[PDB]
Nucleic acid binder design. Structure first.
Lengths: 176, 173, 260, 77, 139
RNA sequence: ACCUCGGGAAAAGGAGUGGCUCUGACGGCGCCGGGUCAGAACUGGAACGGACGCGGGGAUCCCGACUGUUUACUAGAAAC
RNA sequence: CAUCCGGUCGAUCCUGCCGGAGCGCGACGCUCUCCCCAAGGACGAAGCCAUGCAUGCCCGCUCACCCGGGACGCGGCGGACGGCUCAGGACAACGGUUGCACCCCCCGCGGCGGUCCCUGCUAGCCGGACACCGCUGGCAACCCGGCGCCAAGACGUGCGCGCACGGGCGCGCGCCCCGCGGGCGAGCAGCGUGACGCAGCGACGGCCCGCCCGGGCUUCCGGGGCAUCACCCGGUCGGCGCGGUCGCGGCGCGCCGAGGGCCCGACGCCUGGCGGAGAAUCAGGGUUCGACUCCGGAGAGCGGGCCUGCGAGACGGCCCGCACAUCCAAGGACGGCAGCAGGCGCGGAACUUGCCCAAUGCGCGGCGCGCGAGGCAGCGACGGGGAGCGCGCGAGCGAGGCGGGCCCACAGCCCCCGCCGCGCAGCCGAGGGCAAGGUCUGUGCCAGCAGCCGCGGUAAUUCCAGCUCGGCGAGCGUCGCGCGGCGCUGCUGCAGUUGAAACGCCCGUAGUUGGCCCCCCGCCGCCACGAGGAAACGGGAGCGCUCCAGGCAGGCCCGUUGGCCC
RNA sequence: GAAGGGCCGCGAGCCCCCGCGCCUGGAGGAAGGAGAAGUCGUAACAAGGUAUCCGUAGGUGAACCUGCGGAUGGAUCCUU
């Protein structure tokens, strides 16, 4: 009854076991300073995505080589991590997936990519520009600062053609 | 109505069972209809052969015999079989009450008129035990069919060591 | 539940139909016909889902009612009509003729055939019985009862029906060295020659079949379906039931996406 | 029982919480044919049949004799 | 010592079932004496009419007058003693005015200097007590 | 319930019962005795231990344990 | 996805619990910028119901009228599915695995289509006999009575070909067993003959058989707790003969025998007890919950009983008893929301008497309707997901509004496009645990706070305000409970000299446990690998819904996919 | 062949007994816990002024005392 019931849903964040650890409160604030994050949930999501990927890597490393699952599932984890750019292209092994940080999840995010391309003066600048849809990846405008681009789309990231090139010519304050 | 369900029965250990459901049409049982033999044909003709069809599962009609008077009786050795009036029920293994009321049930020893089988007397060397019953006008036979389900009272003439067992049972009277 | 079940839930319907979970609460329930619910796909799914000739269920009725579709050469107007292994699904107006065989994964595949192929239909004799006055009769998987079968044809053999005349054109026996496609079961679609017949009296006969690649596959003899004596004598899917491994399947998927 | 026998089928049941097993017994009611002679302890072979009684769905098709003073022994047969 | 035989699973399963009861927590979770005894009867909270406003003394070494109301729970007609929390909150609660009472937070044990009060008022006459204290809604 | 474990107890309570017509059991067989105990029909103004013979019962308290014995001819008792 | 920390003391080391700290999924308080997704009167009231609606469709038969527009009625099929709920039920239900040589089945598919008679055919095709209908009534209502006309693919009969042919009968294998076979693993099926019977269908040909689908049982293993329940059951356990059923069977009865089940827990009781696929939490091992989506069971106030049908012991069928309604003109009638809204009661707790058959099914019907199935909208901080509350130094949005487009059964939302343009935060804390003032008042063991330890008795780091500050965040606090914590239940993995705790001793059955030894064999467990058995879910291949939770898509493509696992 | 009747079968509901579970009213007894700040002694802990304590029996305002047999957790690891 109601196909809505059959639609799935999941939690994408994992709160810390201890919430008031001073070393782990300060480090999260630094990781909000360099990445322009609104709330700690965004860092928790980053650790949930990394932990799952690391758990796949650890359950495959324990498995013997030439066991078919290690060859197939491991190649699919590596390919995904290479396509996103989380895994450096040169490493090409399962062990290097275990030795990764949430810095690699954050770097692929669009807000950090715009600063690297020098389009954004800061990460705080980029967040506002993406909310104002001034950024297009591969010809598609994005409004999400956690879009996370793939290595191929890195070059195709550009200022939205219809936004800051002034095709409108009367944008916001200029109009009036 | 009547139920052949084992839910009412106790377990092997003798424990009580639990009534998880109400009675179902599939586990229905029907009131038994004892085929009474019409031995009163001379007294009245109002009681004629009355067989009643009943509606069952799958629309499979079952013929229930309420009153019967005749049956096809077969002497297997001689291969002589003829429709014969059934005179009386003498001996039923389950109870003597069925013999008194003259109910026709499968395996009830019945006495049949020998007038159809009178021809067999002419050929000798055809089982002396059957032949002297033929002369007497009553032959020991047993109903071989179920009157309640089939609607007929077909049988066979008791022969060999069977005839001896049932004639010994009815020997004193 | 008081009687026969007239409805099928989408989550309940068999996986080989490949019905999307969000598509509906309900799934098409096949009518009773030549094939069983598990061993058949309805005509609505073989038209609206595979060929997309009808974009909605009402349009499947409109094209089925017009007898445009022909199944085994029969008009077969029922929307939920079962279509199964070896049935000839041909639409003359679009000039397309299809024979339903099983693919390597195990889903049904509408294979393009030729006019000579369309004429014959392959059937497996499940049982030979003395019914109707002790007259000999055979029973094929597609619910076909043929009286007076050739005395030799045994059970498990494959007969070929003329369709127009409904006569057995030829019989292929079930024996070692005979081309067989396993219909149903974990090994489904796979094509191989019988290499072993293990009786296991009182239970199920276990048939081991060998692919051209040399991969040995074992299945119960009910699923096994003889195709011919040394060659299929029927159209076989492009894969020809060699069956790919998971790493090979990954490679074919990557190749297809790259040429987008 | 008259023309009937009770068979003690012995089987192990495995639990996961404790990697050990539980020795378990089930008494199944069979029908002794008058042809077969049996003593309490013999290994019988029982084959499924139509319900023959409330508790009997089996019939003895083979008898293996034992030395009477055969101890007991949990035996999966 | 413990039993370690490949076929002694039954003993270990029985020992665990028997000795599980020694803990008060397993008993206060499965015995069911608590469910019948509790005036909340396993509910998250209950509703009930005020009968008496009582000044309850704090336990030593604390010297104070904690403020509470005796409440007869509509659900089981059972009078409990419930502390009214915060400062001057009792003034909001009148007599016979209906109060929603939840437990203190020790799962049915009396908490703090207050003795025997396992319950505290959360809503007076359908109005949250904390709201009447923060002056968000009037009485 | 209680109890000295013997009792209480016919506890308390219910149900059937006639006449006919049969059917089983049970010894000593060819024979030949038995008169009890079951079971079934069928009947009868809704009748049956049809007269007769033949406990009303239950809960307490006091006293004397009990069976006995006694003031023949006013006390059978808790008295002896 | 392997973490602890505060509290017994003068101090210390322990045991040991208490309290914290994480997550769930409900209640509650307070507050809320926008979009996406989405549960939703289950929770000791399976209490109760006002109102509307949830099951129709068809035309074989039209001298109803619109001329075939066809009203109705008759006939057909469906109303046994689906929707709902979880009361009952603890060797039951249910899940995997079996069997039916013990079975039943509408639709459809594919076969098959010989039906004695006497009387008595009309087969170029037979009767009568009702409904609607007309006419005349009773009737508070409900309900229907009489008379008259006239039809069906309806009804009643019947023209049939003695290899006529439904049922059930009687008879027809053996020679120690196993090896062609219509068929099997197996003596099963079919038929030949002798009697019986005379079934069906043939008045617009279906009996019949296979297949299918559902059912009925049935085989094995799993299938709550309590011993302050240790002995239990007597159709109970077997056998035999009947009956009965769709059929097997103590299912039932008659008769004979005394079995059957138990510390490997019988039986009894109890269950704020549907089961499973699953879910919560989590290193591993585990624990707890299984009202709800899919599957199987059960029930429609409670007991029964029934009819119709192929299938119902049916309740949107009927009959009856009880409980409780309803109307009444007082004679009578008349129900049954654990369908969907909605109300009432109860509780801590739970949505609109909305719309619509367009999708997805199903019932009937080639041209198409019906559906409170299902879809859409509303409500809705159950919850999940994605963005805001600026960037910066002069430019920019989106929140809106207003238009168009798109979308839609109809709107709407989303999104696209022009035009105006108007960012906007809570809730808990700051002595420790546990992140954050030794700030300034008030108060003065009072008031209060404080899960815990503790603060308050005039220099309150703990209260009541201000100030400042921390955490998390459009959410945060509180309560209840499950899991983790907790090697504080210990299989992994606990302890018993003294902290809680070796039975006073000995024998001893059940139980559990038993040295070494034979390579090469049969049975067991065992490990590996297969078959075969629903998905969803949980993974997981591949695919940029703008990301995302999702979904199974997509793009000129393996026969594009949707693999594979559990 | 209708109403109706009979006998059985399936089987409500009511009655009457008897169990069984659950919840309770109740003089008058009788423990435990929390106050209060009371009264009467001072039992134990220092050889606690009679070393404690264990079983068992008796007694006694009350902690307790005493008999008999233990133990040391004693106040003794120690003497032809």
């Amino acid at each position: 009854p109601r196909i809505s019931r059959h639609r799935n849903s999941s939690k994408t964040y994992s709160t810390p076991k201890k919430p008031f650890t001073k070393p782990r409160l300060d480090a999260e604030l630094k990781l909000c300073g360099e990445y322009g994050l609104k709330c700690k949930r965004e860092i928790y999501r980053a650790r949930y995505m990394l932990a799952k990927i690391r758990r796949t890597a650890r359950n495959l490393l324990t498995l013997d080589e030439n066991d078919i699952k290690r060859r197939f599932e491991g190649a699919a984890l590596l390919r995904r991590l290479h396509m996103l750019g989380i895994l450096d292209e040169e490493k090409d092994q399962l062990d290097y997936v275990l030795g990764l940080r949430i810095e690699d999840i954050f770097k692929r995010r669009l807000q950090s990519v715009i600063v690297e391309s020098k389009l954004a003066k800061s990460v705080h600048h980029a967040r506002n520009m993406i909310k104002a849809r001034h950024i297009s990846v591969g010809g598609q405008i994005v409004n999400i600062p956690s879009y996370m681009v793939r290595i191929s789309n890195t070059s195709r990231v550009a200022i939205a053609d219809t936004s800051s090139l002034a095709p409108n010519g009367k944008p916001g304050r200029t109009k009036r | 109505g009547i139920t052949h369900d084992k839910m009412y029965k106790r377990s092997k250990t003798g424990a009580v069972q639990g009534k998880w459901h109400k009675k179902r049409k599939y586990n229905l049982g029907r009131q038994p209809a004892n085929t009474k033999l019409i031995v009163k044909v001379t007294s009245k003709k109002n009681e004629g052969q009355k067989i009643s069809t009943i509606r069952c599962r799958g629309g499979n009609i079952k013929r229930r015999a309420l009153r019967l008077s005749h049956g096809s009786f077969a002497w297997g050795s001689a291969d002589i079989s003829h429709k014969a009036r059934i005179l009386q029920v003498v001996y039923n293994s389950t109870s003597n009450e069925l013999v008194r009321t003259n109910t026709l049930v499968k395996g009830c020893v019945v006495q049949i008129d020998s007038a159809p089988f009178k021809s067999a007397l002419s050929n000798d060397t055809l089982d002396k035990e059957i032949l002297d019953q033929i002369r007497g006008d009553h032959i020991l036979a047993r109903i071989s069919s179920r009157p309640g389900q089939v609607g007929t009272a077909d049988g066979y003439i008791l022969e060999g060591p069977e005839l001896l067992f049932y004639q010994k049972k009815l020997a004193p009277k | 539940a008081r009687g026969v079940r007239k409805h099928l839930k989408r989550l309940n319907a068999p996986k080989h139909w490949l019905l999307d979970k969000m598509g509906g609460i309900w799934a098409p329930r096949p009518t009773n016909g030549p094939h069983g619910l598990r061993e058949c796909i309805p005509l609505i799914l073989i038209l609206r889902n595979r060929l997309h000739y009808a974009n909605t269920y009402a349009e499947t009725s409109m094209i089925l009612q017009d007898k445009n579709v022909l199944i085994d050469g029969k008009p077969r107007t029922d929307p939920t009509f079962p279509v199964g292994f070896m049935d000839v699904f041909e639409i003359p107006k679009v000039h397309k003729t299809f024979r339903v065989l099983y693919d390597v994964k195990g889903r049904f595949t509408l294979v393009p055939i030729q006019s000579n192929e369309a004429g014959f239909k392959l059937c497996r004799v499940q049982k030979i019985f003395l019914g109707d006055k002790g007259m000999p009769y055979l029973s094929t998987h597609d619910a076909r009862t043929i009286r007076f079968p050739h005395p030799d044809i045994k059970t498990n053999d494959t007969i070929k029906i003329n369709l127009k005349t409904g006569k057995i054109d030829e019989w292929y026996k079930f024996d070692i060295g005979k081309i067989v496609m396993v219909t149903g079961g974990r090994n489904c679609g796979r094509i191989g020659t019988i290499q072993a017949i293990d009786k296991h009296m009182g239970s199920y006969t276990m048939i081991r079949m060998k692919d051209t690649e040399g991969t040995e596959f074992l299945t119960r003899l009910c699923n096994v379906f003889v195709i011919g004596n040394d060659s299929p004598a029927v159209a076989i899917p492009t894969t020809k039931g060699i069956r790919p491994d998971i790493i090979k399947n990954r490679e074919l998927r990557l190749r297809s996406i790259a040429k987008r | 029982m008259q023309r009937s026998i009770i068979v003690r089928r012995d089987y192990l049941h495995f639990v996961q919480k404790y990697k050990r097993y539980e020795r378990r017994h089930k008494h199944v009611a069979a029908h002794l044919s008058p042809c077969f002679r049996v003593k309490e302890g013999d290994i019988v072979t029982i084959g499924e049949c139509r319900p023959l009684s409330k508790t009997i769905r089996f019939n003895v098709i083979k008898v293996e004799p034992v030395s009477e003073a055969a101890k007991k022994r949990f035996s999966p047969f | 010592s413990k039993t370690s035989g490949l076929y002694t699973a039954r003993k270990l399963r029985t020992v665990r079932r028997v000795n599980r009861w020694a803990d008060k927590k397993y008993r206060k979770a499965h015995l069911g004496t608590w469910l019948k005894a509790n005036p909340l009867e396993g509910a998250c909270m209950a509703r009930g009419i005020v009968t008496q406003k009582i000044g309850i003394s704090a336990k030593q070494p604390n010297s104070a007058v904690r403020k509470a109301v005796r409440v007869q729970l509509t659900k089981n007609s059972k009078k409990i003693t419930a502390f009214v929390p915060r400062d001057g909150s009792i003034t909001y609660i009148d007599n016979n005015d209906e109060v929603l009472v939840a437990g203190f937070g020790r799962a049915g044990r009396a908490v703090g200097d207050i003795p025997g009060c396992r319950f505290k008022v959360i809503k007076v006459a359908g109005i949250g007590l904390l709201a009447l204290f923060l002056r968000k809604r009037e009485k």
